[PDB]
């Protein structure tokens, strides 16, 4: 008669001593019926481990309604218990999580939001695979759409890259009237896609004229620049001494680094003349663009300061002047026509260098199709200069970063066919996969790594392109199979796919930096020591990172001794000048002096901060790259 009582006793003893599968059977056959200590005993821990092992055995065995009813019963029971410490992470692996969160989130906001979204977002990007993080983003868009604290939903816009989220947060943030602060980090948080989609839907309505008035340009820098000049007061002894030990036509290049990247004071900017005349061609580009780097504000002043260098008697003064016009702004787009108009030399005239500075500057200013149709004769020209396809692939890539799961269109297919057209100047095969992987950015479920793994299987040039697509195609998730695959392929004889493919470590595990320090420095492949050396410089630089810079700082090759002050300056932007004095003790070549001054003045998942150095990983070449080394936009 009362056989559910015998089933309750049987599951009570089998659950009492030990079992793995026989425990939940009397409950799924029992249909349980009929704040206390007994209820916490048989419900809390016995139903927590019981329903947990039932959801695990049924979740891993088959893939019904009984597990849904029991799972919702445990959900409500643990909502009565009000201790969501282990219950949430236990009920994660059994959408069910959608109705779980929208069913649980009624009164408590900061507990489930801060705690659950904190440890479950960090553990969701660390351990949980990707297809569940989309449910985290949509259901978090729901429960955070019904709740306050919009900037966390703006983080959901950083991870979602959706066009409706910015509209709902602009009408909900428009109703709830800081302002300039959320506009500044609003533009900082948004990528290349949703600000042009934002500028087209807000080109339609704009709802106050203040959405393109405020959030299109001039207002991520209108609060900063005057306040940065007001609240800060820099001394002149750095320009005097550190601005006086420059010589040998290379520390003067480091002085164009100074001029460009120290702009409160504008004394070194207007310290007489002949400073650009005594410099070299690539230093004429660096100094012509330096006055563009000193003018990240004052749009009206940029035209009247760079106008002297426009259409001058020298080719590099006007080409670097148009590069300056591209660096000074990113939403004016009024300097295009005088440089973008002609574009026609077809062999080697000025408009090719003006194509460097103007296509690269416009790439910094920018799915734009007209500029790409103008870029068709650019890649079709195939100039012997490397930076043509360099700033072309990087420009169209920065135009294509953050797209809807990427694309395999005839643009990158065209640059792949024309890439494999001629196998000369392998630097093309080194920087073209940069822009290729830039177009691969933004993917969530793209098969472009297998499409490329089928289409570019060839000599290690386009196989190096293939492993570059492998680098940009693994931004980061729970895919430890690529970590053991990383360890397996790490011992390849080819000494460049180790550099890039192993260099992806700083991008893959960029968040969980606890596992980033490894034994890569203890090997004999000094290039791997360079890999860890570059991978260190992405944090505040704790005593462990500087401890790695203690051993990495002392080396004999000019490539590593030159490469250590770069990441040493990126990792630290009063322990700054002490490693510099250590460099003065190591040296006292020219590259290490120019680069150590570059650190002296460099001291004082956004693609804009990830692209310029990953493209900068090919500095070990001629000074031709140094014309692009000074115009890096990743430096805040």
């Amino acid at each position: 008669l009362y056989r559910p009582a015998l089933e309750e006793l049987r599951r009570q003893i089998r659950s009492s001593t030990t079992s793995m599968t026989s425990v939940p059977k009397p409950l799924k056959f029992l249909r349980p019926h009929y704040n206390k200590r007994f209820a916490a005993d048989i419900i809390s821990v016995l139903a927590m481990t019981m329903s947990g092992e039932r959801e695990c055995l049924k979740y891993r065995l088959v893939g019904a309604g009984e597990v849904a009813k029991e799972w919702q019963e445990l959900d409500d029971a643990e909502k009565v218990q009000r201790e969501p410490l282990l219950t949430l992470v236990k009920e994660i692996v059994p959408l069910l999580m959608e109705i779980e969160q929208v069913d649980m989130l009624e009164k408590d906001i900061d507990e489930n939001a801060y705690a659950k979204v904190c440890l479950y977002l960090t553990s969701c990007v660390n351990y949980v695979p990707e297809p569940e993080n989309s449910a985290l983003l949509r259901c978090a868009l729901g429960v955070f759409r019904k709740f306050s604290r919009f900037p966390e939903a703006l983080r959901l816009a950083l991870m979602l890259n959706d066009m409706e989220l910015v509209e709902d947060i602009f009408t909900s943030c428009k109703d709830v009237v800081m302002l300039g602060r959320h506009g500044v980090f609003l533009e900082l948080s948004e990528d290349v896609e949703e600000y042009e989609d934002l500028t087209e839907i807000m080109s339609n309505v704009q709802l106050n004229s203040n959405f393109l008035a405020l959030a299109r340009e001039l207002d991520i820098m209108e609060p900063k620049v005057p306040d940065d000049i007001y609240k800060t007061h820099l001394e002149n002894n750095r320009f005097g001494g550190s601005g006086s030990q420059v010589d040998s036509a290379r520390m003067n290049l480091a002085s164009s680094f100074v001029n460009g990247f120290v702009n409160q004071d504008k004394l070194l900017t207007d310290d007489g003349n002949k400073w650009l005349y005594k410099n070299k061609d690539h230093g004429m580009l660096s100094a012509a663009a330096s006055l563009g780097m000193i003018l990240l504000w004052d749009v009206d002043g940029g035209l009247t300061q760079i106008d002297k260098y426009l259409y001058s008697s020298e080719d590099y003064i006007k080409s670097g002047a148009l590069l300056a016009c591209g660096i000074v702004n990113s939403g004016v787009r009024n300097e295009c026509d005088p440089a973008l108009a002609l574009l026609s030399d077809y062999v080697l005239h000025n408009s090719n260098t003006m194509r460097l500075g103007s296509i690269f500057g416009l790439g910094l200013a920018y799915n734009r199709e007209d500029v790409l149709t103008l870029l068709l004769p650019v890649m079709g020209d195939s100039k012997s200069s490397m930076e043509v396809a360099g700033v072309t692939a990087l420009a169209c890539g920065m135009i294509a970063v953050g797209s809807c799961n990427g694309d395999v269109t005839s643009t990158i297919l065209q640059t792949i066919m024309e890439k494999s057209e001629t196998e000369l100047k392998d630097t093309y095969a080194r920087w073209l996969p940069l822009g290729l992987g830039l177009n691969h950015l933004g993917k969530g479920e793209a098969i472009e790594a297998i499409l490329a793994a089928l289409e570019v299987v060839s000599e290690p040039f386009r196989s190096f392109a293939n492993t570059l697509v492998d680098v940009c195609a693994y931004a980061g998730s729970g895919n430890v199979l690529k970590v053991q695959q990383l360890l397996h392929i790490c011992s390849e004889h080819f000494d460049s796919k180790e550099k890039e493919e192993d260099k992806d470590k700083k991008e893959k595990k960029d968040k969980d930096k606890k596992e980033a320090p490894a034994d890569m420095g203890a090997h004999q492949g000094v290039a791997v020591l360079g890999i860890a050396l570059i991978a260190m410089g992405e944090e505040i630089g704790a005593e462990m990172a500087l401890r790695t810079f203690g051993h990495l700082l002392r080396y004999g090759e000019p490539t590593l001794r030159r490469a250590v002050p770069l990441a040493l300056a990126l990792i630290s932007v009063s322990h700054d000048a002490d490693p510099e004095v250590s460099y003065n003790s190591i040296f006292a070549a020219r590259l290490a002096a120019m680069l150590r001054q570059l650190a002296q003045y460099h001291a004082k998942k956004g693609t804009l901060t990830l692209c310029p150095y990953h493209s900068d990983r090919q500095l070990m070449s001629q000074v031709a790259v140094a014309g692009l080394l000074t115009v890096l936009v990743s430096f805040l």
Binding site: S574, H575, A577, D578
Partner: protein, 212 residues
């Protein structure tokens, strides 16, 4: 106490408070003071150094064990603290528990080297050094004439009020019987910086925790 803390505060914390009397009055005491007290160990001395930690960079160095724990390193760590103190000119250097004199022949040459480096024969006023010990009689007079030229203060017997308040706070949640008095405890102990009565309250609270 503010009296003996304002002079060391303006002494070593000088270039961050009221910058119209260091160069306008023409004082320049770039030598600091030397602290000493029979309890020492940094209880009231650290209570005098806590005011520098308000708005400034602080450096805490207690004891001379890190110099006498190597074969032949010597004053190299002191030179590292002096070069990081040179690069940290707007900071406060606090040296406590100077009991190196109280093998042994190297202590006199690393202490004389500490005197030569602390004087700054080829350096101007850039950083201030604070000296602290338990007994002033064990220290040789070599560290007195070149070292102390500005001001020295004597510290009286320990204060049973502060130690009794610390023991009362640490024994507030604890369970003590009626036969456990405080005067014999605060009287039997001597030369403790407060972390030692905190240590006997940690091993006494854990020892009482062993019985649940």
């Amino acid at each position: 106490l503010d009296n003996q803390i304002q002079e060391i505060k303006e002494s070593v914390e000088l270039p961050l408070t009221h910058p119209e009397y260091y160069e306008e009055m023409g004082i320049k005491p770039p030598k600091g003071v030397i602290l000493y007290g029979p309890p020492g160990t940094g209880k009231t001395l650290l209570a005098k150094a806590v005011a520098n930690q308000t708005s400034a960079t602080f450096l805490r160095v207690v004891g001379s064990e890190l110099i006498q724990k190597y074969l032949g390193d010597g004053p190299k760590l002191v030179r590292e603290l002096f070069r990081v103190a040179e690069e940290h000119a707007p900071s406060i250097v606090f040296i406590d528990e100077i009991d190196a004199i109280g093998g042994e022949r190297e202590i006199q040459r690393t202490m004389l080297e500490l005197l030569n480096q602390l004087d700054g024969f080829d350096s101007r006023g850039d950083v201030k050094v604070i000296m602290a010990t338990n007994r002033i009689e064990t220290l040789d007079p070599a560290l007195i004439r070149p070292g102390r030229i500005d001001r020295k203060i004597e510290f009286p017997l320990p204060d049973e009020k502060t130690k009794k308040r610390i023991f009362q706070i640490h024994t507030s949640r604890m369970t003590l019987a009626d036969d456990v008095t405080l005067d014999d405890l605060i009287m039997a102990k001597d030369d403790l910086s407060g972390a030692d009565i905190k240590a006997i309250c940690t091993e006494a609270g854990l020892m009482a925790l062993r019985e649940r």
